[PDB]
Design a protein around this ligand. Structure first.
Ligand code: ADP
Ligand code: ADP
Ligand code: ADP
Lengths: 334, 334, 334
């Protein structure tokens, strides 16, 4: 293989590079020198490790294609990623839509996806809400509020926002009481087909630790609720829920084709399921998510349609190999 | 194979039909036109899709044997299923025992299984209870009550029961504080052997969502607790607990042989494990349960005794195949 | 194979004996006659079952090497295990270091592992604490105290403690609010190398059941919080946390080399992950833990570096085999 698969050494590089290896690619990890043993000693999946944030020149010399991990754009910056000369697997135009909460909402609405209600004016708050500070990833700064007046008290406490607006591009969103579900998709541009790869429940601290503390005991912890991502727990869904989850994925792809020149490769809809079986989506994560890391040896969904273990990392490598073999590699790269 | 394997297009049909494929059976899904793509496009495991609730005529023409799913008896009704001319994998006589809470309880008691205390008279309520509306499936309408007068308030609210009796065959049950555990079994009539297939913990909304909300913020939601089934999470048990769980299944099978002409094929005991390590069971589900859907690529338990992936779906197809090969297919069908 | 692999019939014997089987060893289970069917009928993994707590003479005649399980030291007692003539996979000198919570902490400190604050004087309690009775196993007898006043009231109720003079070797430990995580390690003495085998979240009763009860309803239960081990749930971690977890294992092995003549074979670091991504460790479990039982068919981590399913049990058998073939069997046995 002429093409090598390259990834930023974080988030899901082990899965991505093992999958590339399994498909006959030579593999490149780049990033901190601190994490190098992980990819070369403990799990020898990287044929090359480059101790640089973005080694453009060497990657071009190695015929690298970058498979973006879930923190690649974060560590490098969206300006650098969009001007990179090294080929990028997926559509770069998708990046602006997922960095803007209003563009996220516009995308979801067009794709006919159920979303929580949003309030521009805090005085209109009619039900418990979750407040999302601008540009926040990983749920940092998030806090809960019950009514218009509880919001102002906490807005001044956490964000310093004096009463009566000056709301620095925060999002005030209806808190939806449902169980967290994260379906992982893959859209094949080569096969013109959408697949369900797997599903997980993200494991977050301290939010998934507080239910172990009895109600009576919680006060003296002086608890602030945090949504720091720690890990992932494998799940399957109720089978009768699969069709609407998959259709939601189809509409998301179709909407992206009409808004941003398409969505292909891995993606995830992060949301909850309510007691009335509704899937309410908080965001479209148009990338490989950490949840796919469970399924190195395939998932309960891939094993229904494949004779071998297929992770999202392997599926990415499969797509790139098939694009090369079908003489259409440029079609999946931007 | 002469015999084709047919299932209702919901609940566990993907697993069942994939398992049948793996054992050399042609496959049939029947149900809603809405779900056809799931079984023919996204996961092509059904060689025939029939867009009818119960196409008896066509099923007989195709030499079908019906493997019952979770939704099958409910959608088609207990009487139709009882009188169906199409062969049914498992014992149909079991259905009347599981549709009645008094009969379930008698069956469990005879099998020496730990069950929660029940209350006929609401005045006798001394510890917290769970109230189960008549005929209710999937946790529909369940509510908690602390004492007699608190029961009466909520019974009027949720069920329209005026104070002082006329309890329309409602079940009032001791709430057992233990962790939900769902062992999945298979009894082979061909082998005369009980197997432990897998274990899961069912994932339910909003009940598994409320522990993410701090005590102080819970009252703002006006939470009615619900047990809508959303998905399934894989587990294993502490090893010293397996013998008790396996002996429980043996007694359940032995009790069914003396009561209802036997229990064979898949079943699940649904319950909790308390701090004193006791397995308290709420019901026997005498069918394939959704939790088995995790284990398409086998389970930590099947991989201890097989050299290949064995789901409950595949295990059924194995049983049917070996029955045909041992000229005893009629023994496993009613 | 001359050498046979022997193990006490509990905790993780199924995984261990199946692992030995896969590596070409004849297998021995020893323990209660009550559990014999588990190991010989339901999962036929034991070539020999001996109905004795510790059958030294028979084990010597069968050329046995004992792979220690969870309850092995508990059942036999520390001194008998220290004086056994049958070879022991691992370092027996480790046993005193993990039986003593002071020596545990001395080991953790030398290994530069983050640990919770400990209180010798209950008047100094400024944050909520967990109280651990002397020598308590399986988290039993543990209770939460939220302040100095709450400690004395619960210490009197549960233990009969009235003042500082009679604290009777209880450990008062800062309650760390974080999600439970249990990484499973293997240090190969043959290959002089540390591996990450898998990770789980231990499933405990009633602590993991109480979050299903709404805060308003919790007081009616009069809850004693318990940490009784019931089962295990598979997880993966966030990728950027793996080096943290792996380096922690390295320092534990290194500190053991200076302190106790080394640590090889399976071990686990039991702890939590806080919102600021700290791995705070409660104890070193210097043995195979029950969380490994999920991964009979390998783990999301072993599948990154192996072409076949590798459990901790199999990995142990691999080590013993390779030690024999490299003529260094005596190096891994005490
Ligand atoms: N409207 C909402 N209602 C309830 N929970 C929410 C809502 N929005 C987000 N969450 C929860 O907050 C956490 C982070 O969500 P999200 O905003 O998608 O993360 P990020 O955008 O930082 O990746 C998740 O656990 C999610 O379930
Ligand atoms: N006596 C009980 N104590 C505690 N929880 C219970 C009890 N009975 C049922 N539940 C819970 O209610 C939910 C529904 O269980 P079950 O009644 O067995 O299913 P179904 O409603 O489909 O018959 C489960 O999550 C179960 O753990
Ligand atoms: N300092 C602590 N803070 C919070 N939780 C703790 C602490 N110590 C122990 N626990 C909890 O108590 C349970 C048992 O802990 P541990 O003592 O490590 O188990 P064992 O020693 O019995 O294997 C676990 O759920 C663990 O998270």
């Amino acid at each position: 293989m002429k093409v090598r698969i390259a990834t930023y050494a974080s988030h899901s590089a082990l899965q991505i590079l093992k999958g590339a290896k399994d498909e006959g690619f030579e593999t490149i990890a780049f990033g901190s020198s601190k994490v190098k043993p992980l990819y070369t000693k403990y799990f020898p999946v990287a044929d090359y490790f480059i101790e640089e944030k973005y080694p453009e020149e060497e990657l071009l010399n190695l015929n690298a294609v970058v498979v973006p991990t879930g923190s690649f754009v974060a560590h490098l910056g969206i300006e650098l990623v969009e001007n990179m000369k090294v080929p990028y697997f997926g559509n770069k135009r998708v990046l602006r839509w997922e960095s803007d909460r209003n563009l996220e909402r516009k995308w979801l609405k067009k794709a006919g996806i159920r979303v929580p209600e949003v309030y521009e004016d805090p005085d209109d708050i009619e039900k418990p809400v979750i407040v999302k500070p601008h540009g926040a990833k990983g749920g940092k700064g998030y806090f809960l509020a019950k009514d218009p007046e509880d919001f102002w008290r906490k807005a001044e406490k956490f964000l310093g926002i004096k009463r009566k607006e000056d709301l620095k591009n925060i999002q005030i969103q209806e808190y939806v009481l449902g169980v967290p579900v994260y379906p992982h998709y893959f859209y094949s541009k080569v096969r013109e087909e959408l697949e369900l790869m797997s599903i997980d429940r993200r494991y977050e601290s301290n939010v998934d630790a507080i239910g172990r503390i009895p109600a009576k005991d919680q006060l003296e912890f002086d608890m602030d609720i945090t949504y720091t991502v720690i890990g992932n727990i494998p799940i399957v869904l109720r089978e009768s829920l699969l069709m609407d989850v998959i259709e939601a994925g189809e509409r998301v792809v179709k909407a992206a084709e009409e808004l941003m020149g398409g969505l292909w490769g891995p993606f995830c809809l992060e949301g909850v399921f309510t007691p009335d079986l509704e899937f309410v989506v908080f965001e479209i994560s148009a990338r490989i998510v950490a949840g796919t890391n469970i399924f190195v040896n395939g998932s309960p969904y891939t094993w229904l349609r494949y004779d071998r273990p297929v992770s999202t990392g392997r599926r990415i490598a499969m797509e790139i190999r098939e694009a090369i073999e079908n003489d259409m590699l440029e079609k999946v790269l931007t």
